[PDB]
Write an enzyme that holds these catalytic residues in place. Structure first.
Site, PDB file in Angstrom:
ATOM      1  N   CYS A  36       0.935  -1.182   0.073  1.00 32.89           N
ATOM      2  CA  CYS A  36       0.034  -0.003  -0.034  1.00 32.89           C
ATOM      3  C   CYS A  36       0.879   1.387   0.068  1.00 32.89           C
ATOM      4  O   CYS A  36       1.319   1.937   1.022  1.00 32.89           O
ATOM      5  CB  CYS A  36      -1.026   0.028   1.272  1.00 32.89           C
ATOM      6  SG  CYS A  36      -1.787   1.664   1.540  1.00 32.89           S
ATOM      7  N   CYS A  45       0.124   4.312   2.133  1.00 37.09           N
ATOM      8  CA  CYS A  45       0.271   4.037   3.449  1.00 37.09           C
ATOM      9  C   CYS A  45       1.626   4.237   3.818  1.00 37.09           C
ATOM     10  O   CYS A  45       2.046   5.098   4.555  1.00 37.09           O
ATOM     11  CB  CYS A  45       0.006   2.803   3.976  1.00 37.09           C
ATOM     12  SG  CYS A  45      -1.704   2.341   3.424  1.00 37.09           S
ATOM     13  N   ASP A  46       2.651   3.356   3.097  1.00 35.66           N
ATOM     14  CA  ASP A  46       3.901   3.234   3.513  1.00 35.66           C
ATOM     15  C   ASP A  46       4.996   4.261   2.421  1.00 35.66           C
ATOM     16  O   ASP A  46       6.058   3.973   2.763  1.00 35.66           O
ATOM     17  CB  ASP A  46       4.307   1.857   3.281  1.00 35.66           C
ATOM     18  CG  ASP A  46       3.267   0.970   4.268  1.00 35.66           C
ATOM     19  OD1 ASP A  46       3.444  -0.140   4.331  1.00 35.66           O
ATOM     20  OD2 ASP A  46       2.523   1.732   5.089  1.00 35.66           O
TER      21      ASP A  46
HETATM   22  C1  LIG Z   1       1.160  -2.549   5.822  1.00 35.91           C
HETATM   23  C2  LIG Z   1      -0.184  -1.838   6.069  1.00 35.91           C
HETATM   24  C3  LIG Z   1       0.111  -0.243   6.324  1.00 35.91           C
HETATM   25  C4  LIG Z   1      -1.128   0.363   6.486  1.00 35.91           C
HETATM   26  N1  LIG Z   1      -1.085   1.635   6.790  1.00 35.91           N
HETATM   27  C5  LIG Z   1      -2.329   2.596   7.117  1.00 35.91           C
HETATM   28  C6  LIG Z   1      -2.092   3.795   7.391  1.00 35.91           C
HETATM   29  O1  LIG Z   1      -1.126   4.300   7.644  1.00 35.91           O
HETATM   30  N2  LIG Z   1      -3.461   4.666   7.735  1.00 35.91           N
HETATM   31  C7  LIG Z   1      -4.704   4.151   7.164  1.00 35.91           C
HETATM   32  O2  LIG Z   1      -5.785   4.936   7.576  1.00 35.91           O
HETATM   33  N3  LIG Z   1      -4.597   2.682   6.773  1.00 35.91           N
HETATM   34  C8  LIG Z   1      -3.759   2.007   6.727  1.00 35.91           C
HETATM   35  N4  LIG Z   1      -3.579   0.688   6.154  1.00 35.91           N
HETATM   36  C9  LIG Z   1      -4.992   0.138   5.384  1.00 35.91           C
HETATM   37  C10 LIG Z   1      -5.896  -0.786   6.710  1.00 35.91           C
HETATM   38  O3  LIG Z   1      -5.032  -1.431   7.482  1.00 35.91           O
HETATM   39  C11 LIG Z   1      -7.103  -1.153   6.069  1.00 35.91           C
HETATM   40  O4  LIG Z   1      -8.037  -0.130   5.604  1.00 35.91           O
HETATM   41  C12 LIG Z   1      -7.716  -2.000   7.469  1.00 35.91           C
HETATM   42  O5  LIG Z   1      -7.127  -3.171   7.662  1.00 35.91           O
HETATM   43  C13 LIG Z   1      -9.286  -2.537   6.790  1.00 35.91           C
HETATM   44  O6  LIG Z   1     -10.022  -3.161   7.863  1.00 35.91           O
HETATM   45  P1  LIG Z   1     -11.347  -3.588   7.538  1.00 35.91           P
HETATM   46  O7  LIG Z   1     -12.359  -3.644   8.603  1.00 35.91           O
HETATM   47  O8  LIG Z   1     -11.616  -3.206   6.061  1.00 35.91           O
HETATM   48  O9  LIG Z   1     -11.005  -5.273   7.680  1.00 35.91           O
HETATM   49  P2  LIG Z   1      -9.498  -5.782   7.229  1.00 35.91           P
HETATM   50  O10 LIG Z   1      -8.506  -5.159   8.271  1.00 35.91           O
HETATM   51  O11 LIG Z   1      -9.242  -5.970   5.891  1.00 35.91           O
HETATM   52  O12 LIG Z   1      -9.538  -7.315   7.901  1.00 35.91           O
HETATM   53  C14 LIG Z   1     -10.200  -7.530   9.265  1.00 35.91           C
HETATM   54  C15 LIG Z   1     -10.358  -8.882   9.648  1.00 35.91           C
HETATM   55  O13 LIG Z   1     -11.803  -9.627   9.974  1.00 35.91           O
HETATM   56  C16 LIG Z   1     -11.441 -10.807  10.272  1.00 35.91           C
HETATM   57  N5  LIG Z   1     -12.693 -11.888   9.258  1.00 35.91           N
HETATM   58  C17 LIG Z   1     -12.631 -11.847   8.031  1.00 35.91           C
HETATM   59  N6  LIG Z   1     -13.542 -12.797   7.788  1.00 35.91           N
HETATM   60  C18 LIG Z   1     -14.226 -13.467   8.982  1.00 35.91           C
HETATM   61  C19 LIG Z   1     -14.965 -14.226   9.064  1.00 35.91           C
HETATM   62  N7  LIG Z   1     -15.809 -14.674   8.161  1.00 35.91           N
HETATM   63  N8  LIG Z   1     -15.321 -14.165  10.455  1.00 35.91           N
HETATM   64  C20 LIG Z   1     -14.804 -13.583  11.643  1.00 35.91           C
HETATM   65  N9  LIG Z   1     -13.820 -12.924  11.137  1.00 35.91           N
HETATM   66  C21 LIG Z   1     -13.308 -12.506   9.951  1.00 35.91           C
HETATM   67  C22 LIG Z   1     -10.064 -11.336  10.078  1.00 35.91           C
HETATM   68  O14 LIG Z   1      -9.461 -12.007  11.458  1.00 35.91           O
HETATM   69  C23 LIG Z   1      -9.268 -10.267   9.481  1.00 35.91           C
HETATM   70  O15 LIG Z   1      -8.288  -9.881  10.696  1.00 35.91           O
HETATM   71  C24 LIG Z   1      -2.358  -0.293   5.943  1.00 35.91           C
HETATM   72  C25 LIG Z   1      -2.634  -1.348   5.639  1.00 35.91           C
HETATM   73  C26 LIG Z   1      -1.310  -2.280   5.585  1.00 35.91           C
HETATM   74  C27 LIG Z   1      -1.074  -3.780   5.281  1.00 35.91           C
END
Ligand SMILES: Cc1cc2nc3c(=O)[nH]c(=O)nc-3n(C[C@H](O)[C@H](O)[C@H](O)COP(=O)(O)OP(=O)(O)OCC3O[C@@H](n4cnc5c(N)ncnc54)[C@H](O)[C@@H]3O)c2cc1C
Ligand SMILES: Cc1cc2nc3c(=O)[nH]c(=O)nc-3n(C[C@H](O)[C@H](O)[C@H](O)COP(=O)(O)OP(=O)(O)OCC3O[C@@H](n4cnc5c(N)ncnc54)[C@H](O)[C@@H]3O)c2cc1C
Ligand SMILES: NC(=O)c1ccc[n+]([C@@H]2O[C@H](COP(=O)([O-])OP(=O)(O)OC[C@H]3O[C@@H](n4cnc5c(N)ncnc54)[C@H](OP(=O)(O)O)[C@@H]3O)[C@@H](O)[C@H]2O)c1
Ligand SMILES: NC(=O)c1ccc[n+]([C@@H]2O[C@H](COP(=O)([O-])OP(=O)(O)OC[C@H]3O[C@@H](n4cnc5c(N)ncnc54)[C@H](OP(=O)(O)O)[C@@H]3O)[C@@H](O)[C@H]2O)c1
Ligand SMILES: [Mg+2]
Ligand SMILES: [Mg+2]
Lengths: 313, 304
Positions: free
Chosen positions: B131, B134-135
């Protein structure tokens, strides 16, 4: 020196403005941000913010805002505490004019001027803002567990608000200036069915008693009569909101109530290079996390548009 | 119960945080493997509120613990099936037990596509990012690579030239799956160097990416790009498999949501986070949509 042409100007403080500033800065767009002579957002009165994700112990409104602000500064945002009087958005090289008459120009503009909650303007009210008098049930409702409270308005908001509060309050007393209600006949219908909802028709508010806390709500005109005191310990105003679109309203598409419309699921207004975040657009969830999100989304959208738009070069 | 939340992460946790505070008594299935995309991120610097930045996990824990404080029931287990049609929705855990609710908040997010080459997963967030928004900052004046031949790889690599002095776009084939304007813009960038017909095979370095082991040169083999940072741009895989027969998804599998809201194509079912968002994958963004799902669900529940 080489006085370059700026990529982005941001109009507005608040979570949407500062998040946009933070992202734009970090993307080296050298954002110029006009904070307002009266800066901060809706959060500069909120004493305890408990639903901004990341802060397990909660944060004071202003504390939260200073951090966002200081964050923005750290990545090279130019923040200025002054007001914009005019705004010319048509064409490339857009333009903004401050209260001192000085013009400041940029390729893209991020509209993030938010939306003022409508208040009653009754002596005690502004004083107890956020220590008894709230304008947001999804925010402060928790803080009124088992209390006797009131909700001021006869619209769908007042209904929705007051209905929602019943999960915390034992009494929600819906006070309204007139006989009928300018609200929906389903929202009213749902309001009337709720056992904790009490109506007070044809009664205008006259003051809000208390020093540290809401102690009572001074009612007055009873259609013909006058004067009374509802012994409540919390007053939620539900008069609506007034989005700050006056600078922009009719260069850009807005809904009838004055909220900026944005294209599809994005932040782009109806003018190329002009973007809208925060409560200036959002009329459904007025949270800081949602404001901060949209603010971020503006900055990204603007980056892409800029990149697309210098790239022919 | 009123609401079951599927997924940890900012979207999940913020939804839980909101639902809980709304006294909806939310049951949240975090997954046996928690957290979100942030559990790998060493230093989060653009999550508004944290002037000094916060470690990914730290931020997550706070979100989690916030959710707990307002009465969320968090469960670190997986959901294997999901019946969404009708009132009284249903969810089944890996242990075979059924858990039901009036509304459901899909917040299972979207996994970034990785190379799975020995060195890569080890240096995740200490050289290898997925990303650039982000980085990208963290790579000022460094020689870096971007892996992919699609519009993301192009956008990603082109963006990074703001920070990197070399962005070296490596790709497995002659032909690019990407657009001929994104390509066109990638080719015009002075800092963009192409490496066609080359597969990656390893990532060198212990504390930091020190090189990128490249592979097959169409016919030949072996070589080392002296890079100090590798951005993967292979796409993302949104976790819609539980929901991808019941609810409308785009071709790539992302849940479509109605208008500018969180409501999916099934009444009482809502979608937040990167499960839906394929354009800005930020935590703020996910947290926002999380919160918006909770509110949408409360209003839908109250409407009745
Ligand atoms: C290296 C890196 C750096 C980043 N830096 C930033 C930053 O600096 N600032 C910023 O704002 N964003 C940053 N991001 C982006 C941010 O991390 C994502 O937007 C965020 O993680 C998305 O969260 P989400 O709720 O969409 O679910 P995700 O984070 O995509 O995933 C959450 C999860 O839900 C669970 N899950 C999935 N399916 C199921 C299921 N069927 N039953 C139960 N649990 C389940 C899993 O355990 C998983 O851990 C970064 C990402 C990365 C990889
Ligand atoms: C008591 C209370 C508790 C709350 N609790 C929470 C909570 O727990 N969690 C949560 O996420 N949210 C919470 N909220 C909601 C939150 O305050 C709002 O959603 C948020 O303030 C929206 O920010 P914004 O950037 O959209 O606009 P605003 O906050 O209004 O800020 C935009 C602004 O732009 C400036 N401006 C406008 N026009 C100009 C101009 N022409 N020139 C210069 N400056 C200009 C103004 O000075 C103002 O600062 C709470 C709100 C209140 C009042
Ligand atoms: N889809 C939605 O419903 C949606 C969702 C969430 C939020 N919202 C927000 O809610 C608004 C929609 O309108 P609304 O629900 O707020 O109703 P409204 O249309 O704003 O109704 C306001 C009424 O409240 C009464 N009132 C105003 N000032 C008063 C005062 N000082 N003293 C006593 N009574 C007073 C008046 O009643 P009388 O004139 O009859 O005397 C006034 O007409 C929008 O602005 C939007 O921002 C909309
Ligand atoms: N629209 C945008 O510019 C943009 C912006 C934000 C987010 N996104 C998101 O990112 C994705 C956009 O698509 P994309 O451009 O990333 O491509 P993609 O749709 O994710 O497709 C992945 C492709 O990468 C190629 N690939 C490149 N290098 C490879 C390698 N080393 N090993 C194996 N396969 C490799 C493969 O085909 P080939 O090898 O034949 O090329 C494979 O089909 C979408 O998921 C979208 O949500 C896109
Ligand atoms: Mg309103
Ligand atoms: Mg992608």
């Amino acid at each position: 020196a080489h006085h370059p042409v700026r990529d982005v100007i941001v109009i507005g403080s608040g979570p949407a403005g500062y998040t946009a500033a933070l992202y734009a800065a970090r993307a080296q767009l050298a954002p110029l941000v006009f904070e307002g002579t009266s800066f901060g957002g809706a959060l500069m009165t909120t004493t305890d913010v408990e639903n901004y994700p990341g802060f397990r112990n909660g944060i004071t409104g202003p504390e939260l805002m200073d951090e966002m602000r200081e964050q923005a500064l750290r990545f090279g945002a130019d923040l200025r505490m002054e007001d914009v009087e005019s705004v010319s958005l048509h064409g490339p090289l857009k333009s903004v004019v401050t209260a001192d008459g000085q013009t400041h120009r940029a390729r893209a503009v991020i509209l993030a001027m938010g939306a003022a909650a409508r208040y009653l303007q009754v002596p005690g009210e502004q004083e107890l803002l956020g220590r008894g008098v709230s304008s947001c049930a999804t925010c402060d409702g928790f803080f009124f567990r088992d209390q006797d409270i009131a909700v001021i308005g006869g619209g769908d908001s007042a209904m929705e608000e007051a209905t929602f509060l019943t999960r915390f309050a034992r009494s929600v007393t819906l006070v309204h200036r007139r006989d009928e209600f300018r609200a929906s006949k389903i929202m009213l219908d749902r309001a009337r069915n709720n056992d904790k909802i009490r109506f007070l028709t044809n009664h205008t508010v006259v003051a809000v008693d208390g020093d540290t806390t809401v102690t009572g709500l001074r009612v007055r005109d009873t259609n013909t009569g006058a004067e009374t005191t509802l012994p409540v310990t919390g007053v939620f105003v539900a008069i609506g909101h007034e989005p700050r679109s006056g600078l922009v309203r009719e260069a850009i598409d807005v809904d009838p109530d004055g909220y900026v419309l944005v294209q599809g699921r994005t932040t782009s207004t109806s003018l190329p290079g002009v973007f809208a975040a925060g409560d200036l657009v959002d009329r459904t969830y007025r949270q800081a996390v949602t404001a901060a999100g949209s603010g971020c989304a503006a900055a990204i959208d603007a980056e892409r548009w800029l990149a697309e738009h210098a790239a022919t070069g």
